[PDB]
Every structure is written in structure tokens, then in C-alpha cells.
Amino acid sequence: XAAXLLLPX
């Protein structure tokens, strides 16, 4: 999604 550049995303 929109949580940094780390999964889930």
C-alpha cells in the first residue's frame, strides 16, 4: 500500500 518501501505495501 503506502507504508514505506516494505511489505505488505
Side-chain angles (χ1 to χ4, degrees):
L5 207 86
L6 63 135
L7 279 303

